[PDB]
Amino acid sequence: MVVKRTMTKKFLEEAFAGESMAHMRYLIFAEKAEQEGFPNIAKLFRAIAYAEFVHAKNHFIALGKLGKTPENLQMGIEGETFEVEEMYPVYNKAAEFQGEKEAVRTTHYALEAEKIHAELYRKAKEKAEKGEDIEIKKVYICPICGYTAVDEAPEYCPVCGAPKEKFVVFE
Amino acid sequence: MVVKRTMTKKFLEEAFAGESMAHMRYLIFAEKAEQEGFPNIAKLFRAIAYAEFVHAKNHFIALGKLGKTPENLQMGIEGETFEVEEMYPVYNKAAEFQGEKEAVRTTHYALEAEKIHAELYRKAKEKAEKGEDIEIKKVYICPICGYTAVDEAPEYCPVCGAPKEKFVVFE
Amino acid sequence: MVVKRTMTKKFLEEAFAGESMAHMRYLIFAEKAEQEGFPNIAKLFRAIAYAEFVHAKNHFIALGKLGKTPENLQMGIEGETFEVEEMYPVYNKAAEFQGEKEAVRTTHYALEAEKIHAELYRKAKEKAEKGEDIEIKKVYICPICGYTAVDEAPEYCPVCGAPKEKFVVFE
Amino acid sequence: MVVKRTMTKKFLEEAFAGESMAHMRYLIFAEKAEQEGFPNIAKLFRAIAYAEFVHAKNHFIALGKLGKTPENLQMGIEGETFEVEEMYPVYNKAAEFQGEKEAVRTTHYALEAEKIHAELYRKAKEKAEKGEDIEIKKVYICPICGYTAVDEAPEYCPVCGAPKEKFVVFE
Ligand SMILES: [Fe+3]
Ligand SMILES: [Fe+3]
Ligand SMILES: [Fe+3]
Ligand SMILES: [Fe+3]
Ligand SMILES: [Fe+3]
Ligand SMILES: [Fe+3]
Ligand SMILES: [Fe+3]
Ligand SMILES: [Fe+3]
Ligand SMILES: [Fe+3]
Ligand SMILES: [Fe+3]
Ligand SMILES: [Fe+3]
Ligand SMILES: [Fe+3]
Numbered sequence: 231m232v233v234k235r236t237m238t239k240k241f242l243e244e245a246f247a248g249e250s251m252a253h254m255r256y257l258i259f260a261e262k263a264e265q266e267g268f269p270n271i272a273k274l275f276r277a278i279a280y281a282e283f284v285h286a287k288n289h290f291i292a293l294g295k296l297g298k299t300p301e302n303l304q305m306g307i308e309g310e311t312f313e314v315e316e317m318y319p320v321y322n323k324a325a326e327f328q329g330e331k332e333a334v335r336t337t338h339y340a341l342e343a344e345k346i347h348a349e350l351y352r353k354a355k356e357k358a359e360k361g362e363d364i365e366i367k368k369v370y371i372c373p374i375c376g377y378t379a380v381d382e383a384p385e386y387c388p389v390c391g392a393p394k395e396k397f398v399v400f401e
Numbered sequence: 402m403v404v405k406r407t408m409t410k411k412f413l414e415e416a417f418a419g420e421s422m423a424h425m426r427y428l429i430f431a432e433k434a435e436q437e438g439f440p441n442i443a444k445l446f447r448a449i450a451y452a453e454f455v456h457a458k459n460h461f462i463a464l465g466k467l468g469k470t471p472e473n474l475q476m477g478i479e480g481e482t483f484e485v486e487e488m489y490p491v492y493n494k495a496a497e498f499q500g501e502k503e504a505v506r507t508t509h510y511a512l513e514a515e516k517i518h519a520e521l522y523r524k525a526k527e528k529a530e531k532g533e534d535i536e537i538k539k540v541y542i543c544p545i546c547g548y549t550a551v552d553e554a555p556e557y558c559p560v561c562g563a564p565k566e567k568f569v570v571f572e
Numbered sequence: 573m574v575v576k577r578t579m580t581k582k583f584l585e586e587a588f589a590g591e592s593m594a595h596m597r598y599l600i601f602a603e604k605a606e607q608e609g610f611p612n613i614a615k616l617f618r619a620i621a622y623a624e625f626v627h628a629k630n631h632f633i634a635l636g637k638l639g640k641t642p643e644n645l646q647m648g649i650e651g652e653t654f655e656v657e658e659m660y661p662v663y664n665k666a667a668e669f670q671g672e673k674e675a676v677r678t679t680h681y682a683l684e685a686e687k688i689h690a691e692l693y694r695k696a697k698e699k700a701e702k703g704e705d706i707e708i709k710k711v712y713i714c715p716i717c718g719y720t721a722v723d724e725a726p727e728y729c730p731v732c733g734a735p736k737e738k739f740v741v742f743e
Numbered sequence: 744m745v746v747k748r749t750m751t752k753k754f755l756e757e758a759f760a761g762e763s764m765a766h767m768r769y770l771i772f773a774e775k776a777e778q779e780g781f782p783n784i785a786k787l788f789r790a791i792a793y794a795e796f797v798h799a800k801n802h803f804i805a806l807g808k809l810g811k812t813p814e815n816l817q818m819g820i821e822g823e824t825f826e827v828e829e830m831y832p833v834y835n836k837a838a839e840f841q842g843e844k845e846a847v848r849t850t851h852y853a854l855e856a857e858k859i860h861a862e863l864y865r866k867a868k869e870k871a872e873k874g875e876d877i878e879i880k881k882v883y884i885c886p887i888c889g890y891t892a893v894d895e896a897p898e899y900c901p902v903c904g905a906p907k908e909k910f911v912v913f914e
Contacts, residue, residue: 235499241492242504245511246425247418248488252480254421254457259473261458266470268534271525277540277549277571278477278518284547285511286425287432292503299434299442306430306449309423317419321412328406332463333413340416340456347449354442363439369448376455378448400448513727556684557733559726564733577841583834584846587853589764590830594822596763596799601815603800610812610876613867619882619891619913620860626889627853628767634845641781644772648791651765659761663754670748674805675755682758682798689791696784705781711790718797720790742790 232294242289249286253279303355310348314341339375342389346378370397403465413460420457424450474526481519485512510546513560517549541568574636584631591628595621645697652690656683681717684731688720712739745807755802762799766792816868823860831857852888855902859891883910 233239260275290296295305318341325333357364370379372387373396385394404410431446461467466476489512496504528535541550546561554565575581602617632638637647660683667675699706712721717732727736746752773788803809808818831854838846870877883896888903898907 233501233504238496238499238504241495250421250425251418258458258461263470270534270537273571277542280542281547281549287429288507290429292507296429302430324412325409328409330404330409333404333409336459336463358439363441366441366445371448371451376452378452400444555730557730559728559730562728562733573845575843575846580838580841580843580846583837592763592767600800600803604809605812612876612879615913616867616879619884622884623889623891629771630849632771634849641776666754667751670751672746672751675746675751678801678805692787696787700781700784705783708783711786713790713793718794720794742786
């Protein structure tokens with residue numbers, strides 16, 4: 231049965247947040263580990279990150295927020311809408327007011343590339359409540375300021391201007 | 402340059418936490434999606450999860466929390482120490498007090514498998530500050546209890562009791 | 573006095589082997605009897621097994637093979653080393669070539685669970701030659717594959733996956 | 744199913760004999776270990792003896808020799824008859840011919856105490872082919888010659904002459 235008590239629900243939510251942060255940290259660590267002269271430490275980081283993923287997935291299953299995909303896409307849609315509409319403009323304005331180049335640059339890379347996720351998820355949801363799988367192939371992603379390019383791939387990234395060969399393909 | 406003003410630091414930390422949460426949720430949704438009649442939805446889910454990972458990595462680099470591998474391993478060591486000493490025992494006792502099965506089960510799985518991660522990180526670190534890479538191969542992770550097996554893999558899982566065929570190989 | 577003539581020594585060794593086999597058979601028969609509606613036949617079997625043990629001990633001592641604890645531990649070390657290094661691998665290979673699943677299973681359990689006994693005996697000998705006893709409590713033995721667990725007990729059996737409750741405890 | 748191939752059967756029989764002998768050897772060693780300033784090595788000895796008992800039981804069942812209670816009692820009857828009628832008289836005669844006092848003493852103690860088991864087993868088998876149990880209680884065993892005394896125990900040992908309080912009781 232789903233967890234109903236408030237205090238333990240808060241405890242499990244905080245544990246899930248910590249596990250997600252740890253998994254992100256390990257995934258980031260592995261990239262620099264393989265950039266140096268240690269190709270095995272990256273393997274260790276990847277394995278431990280997968281262990282953290284398993285922990286966080288168990289915590290997510292316990293709280294009971296995961297179900298059928300047609301209703302599951304709505305949470306992603308709402309999260310993307312919140313990230314693009316409200317949270318990011320305020321952070322960009324605050325970073326402009328305080329005057330940090332790095333924060334402004336990162337927020338600018340963020341809000342301009344997060345716009346397509348909501349549209350893609352809405353299309354996927356309205357095409358996937360009848361029992362059929364959507365027709366999509368070769369989703370491309372920029373490795374610096376990831377811009378979800380669908381099917382075809384632009385020669386240069388409109389946001390950062392990276393060359394096409396750097397795109398990480400998914401198939 | 403690292404962010405020094407307090408408000409921008411808080412905002413970027415919150416953004417990093419949100420992006421990590423988004424990545425983990427998208428990964429879980431992808432794993433559920435591939436388990437049913439829609440194969441191509443998981444591709445989109447994993448692509449957008451990679452995009453969230455890129456955003457989180459940019460936010461993490463913005464706060465300048467990344468250094469060389471010797472110092473990188475210290476953060477993991479401290480995180481594992483805190484996860485296995487302070488948080489999980491208290492959460493398990495609270496879940497026992499309130500009397501719910503799922504939280505106790507998940508915390509029981511979690512607290513019995515995080516003791517080896519600190520030892521692995523310490524072993525990697527002592528070999529990393531000298532200039533060489535450790536030797537490791539065939540790392541197994543249980544997909545129903547997160548249990549790190551080094552090199553040899555037991556026939557049955559000493560935590561959940563799953564056969565050695567169910568494990569996942571990270572080579 | 574100890575027996576020195578050859579044929580007397582051969583006869584005593586054969587008698588020792590016969591008494592040991594009879595004691596094992598009576599123990600197995602008693603264990604089977606307890607699993608039925610005859611609880612007193614098990615008592616008779618246990619008493620007669622103890623009598624066979626007394627006869628076997630007399631035969632063994634008459635050969636002059638009982639010494640202080642160091643030499644007994646050394647003899648156990650040699651026996652365990654021979655059991656794990658030479659006999660069981662060849663027996664398992666021959667059984668697998670012939671094609672009987674029960675023989676392969678039994679020999680697999682025997683050569684997987686007999687590896688610690690030698691290390692325990694050598695540690696005990698190292699701690700029991702100066703003049704002191706070895707600190708150890710609450711040993712665990714599996715009832716379906718003979719798995720030794722010292723002090724702590726794993727949640728599950730790494731060899732057969734038998735639950736924790738089924739472990740027999742010696743203290 | 745039963746093992747039918749010849750060489751696998753031979754290897755299983757040899758392993759059964761070896762495990763039984765090792766179990767008896769460690770049972771013998773435990774009593775001397777606890778009779779010294781090392782009262783905890785007996786715990787290890789008994790735990791390893793139980794593990795070898797499990798291994799020997801596995802080998803015994805692999806051969807398919809365990810059956811219902813009447814068949815087990817018949818096997819015990821045959822074994823005891825062979826042990827008393829043919830083996831021990833010849834062993835005693837050979838020991839007397841060669842001239843060893845210890846072997847003669849041991850065989851003398853054995854052949855004058857093993858004569859009471861066959862009738863006990865015959866009575867138990869006669870009373871066990873009727874769903875009912877035999878009616879015995881408080882079996883006494885001598886510690887230095889294995890004298891099986893049923894119910895009432897003599898004040899002294901008719902074979903060696905040890906007092907009654909040295910007997911071990913099973914009830
Ligand atoms: Fe963790
Ligand atoms: Fe997004
Ligand atoms: Fe770009
Ligand atoms: Fe996002
Ligand atoms: Fe961890
Ligand atoms: Fe497991
Ligand atoms: Fe007997
Ligand atoms: Fe006998
Ligand atoms: Fe052994
Ligand atoms: Fe087992
Ligand atoms: Fe053995
Ligand atoms: Fe006696």
